[PDB]
Amino acid sequence: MNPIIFIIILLTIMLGTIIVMISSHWLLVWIGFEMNMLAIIPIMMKNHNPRATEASTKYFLTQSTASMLLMMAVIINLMFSGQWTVMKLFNPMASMLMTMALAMKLGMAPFHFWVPEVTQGIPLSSGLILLTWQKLAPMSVLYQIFPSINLNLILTLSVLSILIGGWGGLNQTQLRKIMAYSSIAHMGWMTAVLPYNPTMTLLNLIIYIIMTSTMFTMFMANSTTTTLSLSHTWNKTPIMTVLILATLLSMGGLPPLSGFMPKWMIIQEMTKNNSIILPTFMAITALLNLYFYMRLTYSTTLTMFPSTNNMKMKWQFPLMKKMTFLPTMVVLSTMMLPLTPMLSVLE
């Protein structure tokens, strides 16, 4: 891939997301989704190996099916309303189809099976796009149709995502599958608060993106994709292990780290609506996420695993990866709890 071609394709991925976000017409929203899927597959196939081919095919089949259900909902909405405006849907069957269509696009459980596999099959840079940028467009549509979403359906997906994400991460030794299951679990929190306060869905989304972007950027820096490969970081870049520790604890929602904020704010919103059993269940089940974050901090930062002799050759060479924005993202990933009231800007 010619560098100019990569930029144009990369700009098209953003263009499709932006089209969804600025569109007031259901057709243009669907077009934006198609444009996004068209441009992301070549990024997935960038390295041209059988695994990347499998991931791209599994991704394409899933996203195509969601687009069909989404467009079906739009046409049903047109029959029962005669209009195309992006807003609440006027038919409950259309609401179900759109909600499920967006659930597949996000990778929410039980439409989650593709997220672990696609993420594992593609490079880290592509996985970063998949688990962060690709969340924006479906969430922005959910942010506009939520008044007509069936409450039981959306909360059922949120609960299942948190459980399935929590349990799925416990068995993983690959860093890309850990980030996939962690992503599934975090998506559950975003949609659980969606019916009550959409602002806290945006807050959780932004903070999830900052923390996920930081973790992928640190994995890219040392070119690590397994738990054991990451366990050598202490012997080359000690500073990196400390940043991984702080970021991982934040992702686990431990105060006083930034990652505690979205969980804190979502519990507040749910209790204000006399929803007590669900936030309690959610917070406890999120302890599964913390458990398999803590294993990574054990093998990465708090202990020292054995090295290999050839590691000494890497002591003589500096990191040359861009690590774009890493110093800023890690500070935002960890030291933002004192600034929590700034969430009103999202209002």
């Binding site: 499998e54 069909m68 259900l69």
Partner: protein, 97 residues
């Protein structure tokens, strides 16, 4: 609703179940995807034509344009799947288990 909608809606459902219930050939599933667009095209056209909403008469055309892109995208992936395993069978796409 009008009785035509019963069969067009049924047609969409048949292709949806067609897509979700795979066999071996990945090509067969790509046809069920083009089947869903065909029914979506037809059902959109009936609604738009019957209601005399002129400006959306271009909507079904745009629908076909982005169906062609998906089919071209789907066929491209089938080429690379076939070049790897020598068939388009979907059971070969299980490295990532």
């Amino acid at each position: 609703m009008s009785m035509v909608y019963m069969n067009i809606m049924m047609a969409f459902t048949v292709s949806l179940v067609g897509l979700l219930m795979y066999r071996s050939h990945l090509m067969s599933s790509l046809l069920c995807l083009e089947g869903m667009m065909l029914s979506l095209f037809v059902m959109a056209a009936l609604t738009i034509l019957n209601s005399h909403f002129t400006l959306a008469s271009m909507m079904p055309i745009i629908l076909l344009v982005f169906a062609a892109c998906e089919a071209a995208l789907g066929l491209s992936l089938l080429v690379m799947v076939s070049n790897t395993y020598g068939t388009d069978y979907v059971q070969n796409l299980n490295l990532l288990q």
